[PDB]
Design a protein around this nucleic acid. Structure first.
Ligand SMILES: [Mg+2]
Ligand SMILES: [Mg+2]
Ligand SMILES: [Mg+2]
Ligand SMILES: [Mg+2]
Ligand SMILES: [Mg+2]
Ligand SMILES: [Mg+2]
Ligand SMILES: [Mg+2]
Ligand SMILES: [Mg+2]
Ligand SMILES: [Mg+2]
Ligand SMILES: [Mg+2]
Ligand SMILES: [Mg+2]
Ligand SMILES: [Mg+2]
Ligand SMILES: [Mg+2]
Ligand SMILES: [Mg+2]
Ligand SMILES: [Mg+2]
Ligand SMILES: [Mg+2]
Ligand SMILES: [Mg+2]
Ligand SMILES: [Mg+2]
Ligand SMILES: [Mg+2]
Ligand SMILES: [Mg+2]
Ligand SMILES: [Mg+2]
Ligand SMILES: [Mg+2]
Ligand SMILES: [Mg+2]
Ligand SMILES: [Mg+2]
Ligand SMILES: [Mg+2]
Ligand SMILES: [Mg+2]
Ligand SMILES: [Mg+2]
Ligand SMILES: [Mg+2]
Ligand SMILES: [Mg+2]
Ligand SMILES: [Mg+2]
Ligand SMILES: [Mg+2]
Ligand SMILES: [Mg+2]
Ligand SMILES: [Mg+2]
Ligand SMILES: [Mg+2]
Ligand SMILES: [Mg+2]
Ligand SMILES: [Mg+2]
Ligand SMILES: [Mg+2]
Ligand SMILES: [Mg+2]
Ligand SMILES: [Mg+2]
Ligand SMILES: [Mg+2]
Ligand SMILES: [Mg+2]
Ligand SMILES: [Mg+2]
Ligand SMILES: [Mg+2]
Ligand SMILES: [Mg+2]
Lengths: 181, 190, 166, 140, 103, 148, 95, 97
RNA sequence: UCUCUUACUUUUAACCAGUGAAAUUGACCUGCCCGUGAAGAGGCGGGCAUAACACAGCAAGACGAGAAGACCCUAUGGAGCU
RNA sequence: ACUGAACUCCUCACACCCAAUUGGACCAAUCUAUCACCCUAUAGAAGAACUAAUGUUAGUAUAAGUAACAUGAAAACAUUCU
RNA sequence: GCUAAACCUAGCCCCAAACCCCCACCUUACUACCAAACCUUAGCCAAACCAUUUACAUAAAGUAUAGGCGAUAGAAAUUGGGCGCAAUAGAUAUAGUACCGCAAGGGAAAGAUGAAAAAACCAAGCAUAAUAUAGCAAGGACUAACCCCUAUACCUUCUGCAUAAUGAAUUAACUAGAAAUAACUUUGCAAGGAGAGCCAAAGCUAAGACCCCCGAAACCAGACGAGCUACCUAAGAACAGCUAAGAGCACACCCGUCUAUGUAGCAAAAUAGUGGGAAGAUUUAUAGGUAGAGGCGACAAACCUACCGAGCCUGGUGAUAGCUGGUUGUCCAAGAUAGAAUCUUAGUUCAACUUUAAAUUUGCCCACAGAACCAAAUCCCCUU
């Protein structure tokens, strides 16, 4: 027995890295982890995108429908998402066609509608939503957040930005995050 | 370090038991050359450069430096607001619970070094109080030292003890070089 | 010493959902300290490593080696265990998925050589680990045909890029 | 043993983490690993002089390949793109030839016009007015 | 070396410079000991310059945890989910202020 | 330690060995420079500059006779009877600007240092002390604790 | 020399240094010239006068003899009638 | 694999022990105790180095001289062999001369 | 014995089954030619050759393994003898 | 004419390519003093760091499943035969 | 996933204190009983050989003296519990046991559950999972493992090593810089410093900081060995048959000529065939004797417990080695070749060169002029 403590401590922490390289844990969502304040991350969510929301109306854009059902289920042992998400999906469809009918006038309406279905599909929006911290802020039931719900949460953010700062700032939010895809 | 005597000793290759002859000849087999089975190389052999004997680390600083160190540690407890001067170390009761609350009320610290003047004339109340306390220590005035003034947060002197140190430490400044040690009788010293 | 192969028969999976295919049984079994070497056991363990358990007992009844008489005692106790303890209905519906051999704790004796010199003789021991999985044995991998070599070559031509430029 | 080494495991793994992709016992045995991990690090810094050498030799072999498509040799293209003060380096000229072959056909047309203006100035010795693409731009 | 270590292509996260520049930090998380000489500079960073830092970029949400640790860490989490946990152990105040601006 | 010679092995020859030739400290003939050195008498010199300086600072009291004890108690000269000091010699350095009516008893005294004390009205006498008698007159208190 | 004696544990001095050389307290060693009484009949009177001289030693010879003697031979010696008394102090050096 | 798998039991050190809280007391018993005792009279250890510091040769010379008359019979022979060895090492071997 | 060797038997052998050592060993993913070079190269230079793998022989090479060359010379190293 | 270096220029950064020797700045781990309290700080100390001694001891390789080793036959396993 | 790993307390080291402990057994020890001890240590080693010689409280003092006056040796008067180890460590110790040797003597290894048994992850090595042209095993790379391009393992020793020079299978653990005066740095105090002794013409006191590991053949002292063998003593034994006396042929026996096998062997000297003697100066069982400055010897300088130009063991002994090997974290900086002495040329001392710190003022390059009579250049040299 070599006497001492500092080398026996380091090996205890190199075993715990190998215990996660042999058996990695399941992913836990960000709100069940240390150093998380849900009110402070939303105000930081706005200023990150150089744009300003009405912070109560942005808070209702993240709470989904399946979350309210499973908040009443654990209550035996809030507005929904659908109103802001319907405004944001319907506007960003007419905003994206106005962007693409202006730049590509020769394209038919079949090919423009197939371009908006790409720019608002589950492959583009849920890739954009995971790199703007929308999965971290959304309130859902199951984790990792399914791409049918995370797309609803992303367009509720565009729907909340429409009521906050009008359709001029919101079209620049679609130009910088959806047309860059 | 001056009090330290380290009792570490290891057997060198001459005090280790056995190992007199060559184990195998110098040049027959294909093994290495060896002269005893108690070399520093061998398992069980002697230590090449281990600790040897009881070692003493005794040295004496010049006494004008050991006295200046007591002066230096007294200005520090005065400037850092850690020195407290009493008139007598006398308490109304000898409980530790009263003395511990008094240090917490006056915001002294966790560790107090109470320094009376003479060990045999210490009052009975402070002796039965501090004897059960770990971080409250009674020393006489002769037992003042730099190390225990730094281990304790506050230093509590008395008014005879303050005059004791001014007689003793200001004698080191303004004094002759010695002719023979001051344990011998001089004309004006003791 | 370690005995982790004996403890693999005690893992209890959660009870299955009906919207899920049926999990096959796994039966880990081993014999330790066989007086036989660990690399003479590998030729017998490599032989039976994909076979069904009835073909494995056939090819071991007629092998002349010493360990074939011992593996056949291991495979019979693990087949009797699968209908008794681990809930397999058919004895014949098993195949060997893993069949290996580790070394065991070996003893040391003295072998005398021709002069004052000698050697250190080691009495070899070995382990034999088997896993039976319930089911028909999977078919052996066929050699990849000339169609499959041509696809891989054309996919290697198709994947190349202009390297060290834009 | 008063103080012997308690952390020798982590000094071995400082070397052995670089050797994990080797062959033989160089990926496991420490004595064989340090003589190759050191040797794998010296080759890593001596090949910073060979990457810049082998890239320029590649660029020269991709400019020589594309200048031959227009009938130019390599010294007839570089030597006369300098004379028109077109200071494009080998990296762009080898990346113009692959990705923009119309612009590279214009640089082969320009380096051959200046070449013919260099011959016509050289056969007509004595004072003749300069060529059109042979006029230098002076900076002061 | 380069044949040992993985490699990648030069990319950005979501075409980070095309439309607008999005600050890519989400969080910084400081563990800072209250009593401890290893976090002497980390206590002076929180006292002096973490308030000047938390106003220079309001997208980063900063958590100072202040628990009894021997080694003070800084846990920078980014927008693509990556976590770069680094130590500010026994660093001066000018050395944490560039280590955080690098993050 | 160097390459493998006699330096790295650690077995160099003694100090003064010059490789085999007869060394420098042995090539030289013997001369009686230090022949009877432990029987030569030594006298610690006390200049009149130092004697005046001890008078003007209250360390040597000139209203009493200046013995060798009073020079040592005022710590103006320290003499060691081992290492063969036989006392204090008087030294003519500083004879001008010497102003003391003094009664001094040094062991040796030059002709001009006597003249510079007798001029100011003093008395110079030269006494003798054995090494046993000198070891008593310097530090008398470790003699009075000896019981003799 | 003996760096550590077996009785006391101090340095000894080479006593062949002492019977040959004289140390002045400035740091100089003083020696007689070799052969100053050998074969004087075959020497010219100029050569005989060079040998009858106390000469100083080198820098390295003085550092070798300083190691060969202890600190007893490096002290002030206030002899009565030392003829080498005036040579112990060093006047007027500019190093 | 010379590294332990479990981290050792925790070293609890009482910094307010008897020997720790009163450490250092009476080290200045000379300079403020009227010089009746030296602080070298406060150190407790072997007889031959109560107030004395030397190297290994000077310690064995002093141990043989002070306490060697009452040393054990093969501890005195192990000491005489050590002084016979350390004499030859310090006076004949080494780099500097 | 040889010119000038041949046949058979036994042991060994080789195969199968059991038991199971030793010297050795920098790492080896271990070619040939000519040149080079600490003056004789699997490894460097220029060529030539080149799917991967056992098993049996062989002894040209690995300056093959063994034994800190006994020859020789050196050491202000030993010893025997006269 | 082009090719062509660690030379030189370029963008940024610079204490960051000699043997023996010498000077200097740091430091792993340990114990001690006092702190610290998921593993540290400032100091004091010392059996304070091993890719090499035909090193020592233990484990395990390679040569190697190699060299080598063993039981007369039949049978009712009573017996008989060679 | 096998092999394995890990563990902490057995015990120990250094001090302080206190001065320790029924029966049988010197004959063949463990056996009931019958006619005289005292006598210098030597030698390695140091002297670079060796021959006289060489160490076995503080202070005076490394002083007086001694000495191939040289290596070195050296007084006296007088003065007066742990900044230890924690199963390769610490004792050799679980034990002076097992084992080894005729004997003296040498001398090991190792264990780990839990409150109660009356209850995983990590070395080497393998397996999971053999291999694809090409070459120090990598690097630059690359869409891509290889293919392409580049690259003569490491240590040591050297004028110079990929060298076909040394060492090394590999893993784990262990394994190698110990100190002086003087200087320097930093304090204290200062013509004085220092807790007596000592130094002092700025000194003095205290601290910090520099000096390795393994290895001979030997030499000496004291034991232990003549169960092998050399010779002797005592008292024994053995030698068929055939021909006619250290006779012949020939067994048993003893010896070992020659060949072959064997060469880590059956055997640390043997087997198979052949050969020499075999009633003698023979062979042999048993007990005794002679012992290492010696014994013994039909002299082979043979033999004396497997190695005898002088046994073996322990001790001096950590012998000595100018000779070989080894000399362990990181980074930076300066840094190469005149010579002289030497029982010396394998080494060392001094110089030269190198390094650091300090003080100062010139250094290098050089122009005229100048340097002897019987070629290239240099020396000297202000300017610059
Ligand atoms: Mg011994
Ligand atoms: Mg060998
Ligand atoms: Mg030897
Ligand atoms: Mg030991
Ligand atoms: Mg042992
Ligand atoms: Mg084996
Ligand atoms: Mg000579
Ligand atoms: Mg064969
Ligand atoms: Mg077989
Ligand atoms: Mg082996
Ligand atoms: Mg060749
Ligand atoms: Mg073959
Ligand atoms: Mg080779
Ligand atoms: Mg010689
Ligand atoms: Mg000799
Ligand atoms: Mg170039
Ligand atoms: Mg630079
Ligand atoms: Mg430290
Ligand atoms: Mg060490
Ligand atoms: Mg190691
Ligand atoms: Mg080794
Ligand atoms: Mg094998
Ligand atoms: Mg083979
Ligand atoms: Mg065979
Ligand atoms: Mg000698
Ligand atoms: Mg020598
Ligand atoms: Mg005496
Ligand atoms: Mg042990
Ligand atoms: Mg492994
Ligand atoms: Mg190649
Ligand atoms: Mg070369
Ligand atoms: Mg080699
Ligand atoms: Mg060599
Ligand atoms: Mg080898
Ligand atoms: Mg006999
Ligand atoms: Mg006869
Ligand atoms: Mg006959
Ligand atoms: Mg005979
Ligand atoms: Mg003869
Ligand atoms: Mg002869
Ligand atoms: Mg030696
Ligand atoms: Mg340099
Ligand atoms: Mg030599
Ligand atoms: Mg000049």
């Amino acid at each position: 027995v070599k006497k001492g403590f500092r080398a026996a401590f380091r090996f205890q922490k190199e075993l715990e890295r190998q215990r996660l390289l042999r058996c990695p844990p399941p992913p836990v969502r960000r709100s069940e982890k240390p150093n998380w304040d849900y009110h402070a991350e939303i105000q930081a969510f706005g200023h990150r995108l150089q744009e300003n929301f009405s912070l109560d109306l942005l808070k209702t854009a993240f709470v989904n429908s399946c979350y309210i059902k499973s908040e009443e289920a654990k209550r035996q042992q809030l507005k929904s998402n659908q109103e802001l998400s319907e405004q944001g999906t319907s506007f960003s469809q007419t905003c994206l066609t106005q962007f693409l009918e202006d730049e590509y006038p020769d394209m038919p309406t079949e090919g423009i509608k197939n371009l908006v279905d790409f720019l608002t599909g589950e492959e583009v929006v849920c890739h954009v939503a995971r790199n703007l911290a929308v999965e971290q802020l959304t309130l859902s039931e199951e984790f990792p957040v399914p791409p049918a719900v995370l797309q609803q949460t992303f367009f509720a953010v565009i729907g909340a930005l429409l009521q906050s700062s009008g359709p001029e700032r919101t079209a620049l939010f679609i130009r910088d995050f959806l047309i860059t895809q | 370090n001056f009090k330290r005597i380290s009792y570490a000793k290891t057997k060198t290759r001459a005090e280790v038991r056995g190992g007199g002859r060559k184990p195998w000849p110098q040049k027959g087999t294909g093994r290495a050359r060896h002269g005893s089975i108690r070399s520093p190389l061998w398992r069980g052999g002697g230590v090449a450069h281990g600790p040897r004997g009881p070692t003493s680390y005794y040295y004496m600083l010049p006494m004008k430096v050991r006295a200046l160190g007591l002066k230096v540690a007294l200005t520090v407890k005065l400037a850092q607001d850690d020195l407290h001067i009493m008139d007598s170390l006398e308490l109304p009761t000898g409980d530790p619970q009263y003395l511990t609350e008094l240090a917490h009320y006056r915001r002294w610290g966790d560790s107090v070094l109470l320094v009376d003047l003479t060990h045999e004339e210490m009052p009975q109340s402070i002796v039965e109080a501090t004897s059960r306390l770990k971080t409250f220590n009674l020393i006489p005035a002769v037992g003042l030292n730099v190390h225990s003034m730094l281990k304790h947060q506050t230093l509590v002197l008395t008014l005879p003890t303050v005059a004791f140190l001014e007689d003793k430490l200001l004698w080191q400044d303004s004094r002759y070089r010695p002719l023979y040690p001051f344990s011998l009788p001089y004309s004006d010293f003791p | 010493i370690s005995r982790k192969w004996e403890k693999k028969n005690k893992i209890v999976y959660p009870p299955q959902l009906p919207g899920e295919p049926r999990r096959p049984a796994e039966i880990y079994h081993c014999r330790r300290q066989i007086k036989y070497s660990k690399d003479k056991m590998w030729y017998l363990a490599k032989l039976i490593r994909g076979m069904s358990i009835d073909q494995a007992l056939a090819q071991l009844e007629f092998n002349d080696k010493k360990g074939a008489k011992i593996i056949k005692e291991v495979l019979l106790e693990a087949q009797d265990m699968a209908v008794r303890d681990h809930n397999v209905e058919f004895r014949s519906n098993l195949y060997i998925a893993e069949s290996t051999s580790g070394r065991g704790q070996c003893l040391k004796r003295i072998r005398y050589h021709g002069r004052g010199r000698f050697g250190i003789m080691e009495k070899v021991y070995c382990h034999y680990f088997v896993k039976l999985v319930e089911g028909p044995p999977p078919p052996p991998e066929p050699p990849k045909t000339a169609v499959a070599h041509a696809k891989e070559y054309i996919q290697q031509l198709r994947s190349r890029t202009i390297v060290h430029t834009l | 043993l008063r103080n012997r080494v308690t952390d020798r495991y982590f000094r071995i793994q400082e070397v052995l983490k670089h050797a994990r992709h080797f062959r033989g016992r160089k990926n496991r045995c420490y004595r064989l690993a340090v003589r190759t991990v050191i040797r794998a690090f010296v080759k890593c810094t001596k090949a910073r002089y060979l990457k810049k050498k082998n890239m320029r030799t590649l660029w020269i072999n991709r400019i020589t390949a594309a200048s031959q498509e227009h009938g130019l040799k390599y010294p007839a293209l570089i030597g006369n793109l300098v004379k028109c003060q077109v200071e494009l380096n080998r990296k762009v000229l080898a990346d113009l030839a692959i990705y923009e072959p119309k612009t590279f056909k214009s640089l082969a047309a320009l380096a051959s016009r200046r070449r013919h203006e260099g011959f016509a100035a050289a056969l007509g010795d004595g004072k003749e007015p300069e060529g059109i693409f042979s006029r230098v731009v002076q900076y002061h | 070396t380069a044949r040992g270590t993985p490699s990648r292509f030069l990319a950005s996260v979501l075409h980070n410079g095309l439309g607008r520049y999005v600050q890519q930090l989400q969080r910084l998380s400081f563990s800072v000991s209250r009593d401890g000489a290893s976090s002497r500079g980390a206590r002076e960073f929180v006292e002096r310059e973490v308030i000047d830092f938390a106003r220079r970029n309001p997208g980063v949400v900063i958590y100072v945890n202040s628990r009894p640790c021997c080694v003070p860490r800084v846990v920078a989490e980014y927008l693509n989910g990556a976590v770069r946990e680094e130590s500010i152990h026994c660093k001066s105040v000018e050395e944490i202020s560039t280590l955080v601006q690098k993050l | 330690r160097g390459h493998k010679g006699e330096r790295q092995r650690g077995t160099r020859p003694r100090l003064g060995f010059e490789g085999g030739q007869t060394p420098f400290y042995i090539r030289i003939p013997k001369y009686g420079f230090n022949e009877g050195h432990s029987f030569r008498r030594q006298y610690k010199p006390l200049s009149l500059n130092r004697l005046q300086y001890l008078i003007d600072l209250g360390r040597v009291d000139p209203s009493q006779p200046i013995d060798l004890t009073q020079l040592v108690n005022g710590r103006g000269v320290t003499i060691q009877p081992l290492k063969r000091d036989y006392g204090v010699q008087l030294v003519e350095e500083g004879a001008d600007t010497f102003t003391a009516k003094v009664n001094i008893e040094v062991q040796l005294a030059s002709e001009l240092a006597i003249a510079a004390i007798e001029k100011n009205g003093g008395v110079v006498t030269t006494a003798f002390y054995d090494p046993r008698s000198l070891d008593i007159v310097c530090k008398p208190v470790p003699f009075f604790l000896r019981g003799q | 020399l003996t760096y550590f004696s077996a009785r006391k544990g101090k340095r000894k001095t080479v006593k062949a240094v002492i019977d040959r050389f004289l140390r002045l307290h400035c740091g100089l060693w003083v020696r007689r010239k070799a052969g100053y009484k050998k074969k004087l009949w075959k020497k010219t009177p100029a050569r005989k006068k060079r040998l009858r001289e106390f000469v100083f030693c080198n820098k390295t010879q003085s550092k070798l003899l300083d190691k060969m003697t202890t600190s007893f031979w490096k002290r002030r010696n206030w002899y009565v009638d030392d003829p080498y008394q005036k040579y112990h102090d060093r006047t007027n050096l500019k190093v | 694999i010379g590294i332990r798998l479990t981290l050792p039991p925790p070293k609890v050190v009482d910094r307010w022990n008897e020997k720790r809280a009163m450490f250092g007391v009476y080290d200045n018993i000379g300079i403020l105790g009227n010089f009746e005792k030296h602080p070298k009279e406060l150190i407790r250890g072997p007889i031959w180095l109560r107030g004395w510091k030397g190297n290994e040769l000077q310690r064995c010379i002093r141990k043989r001289k002070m306490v060697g008359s009452r040393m054990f019979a093969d501890d005195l022979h192990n000491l005489n062999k050590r002084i016979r060895y350390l004499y030859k090492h310090f006076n004949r071997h080494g780099k500097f001369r």
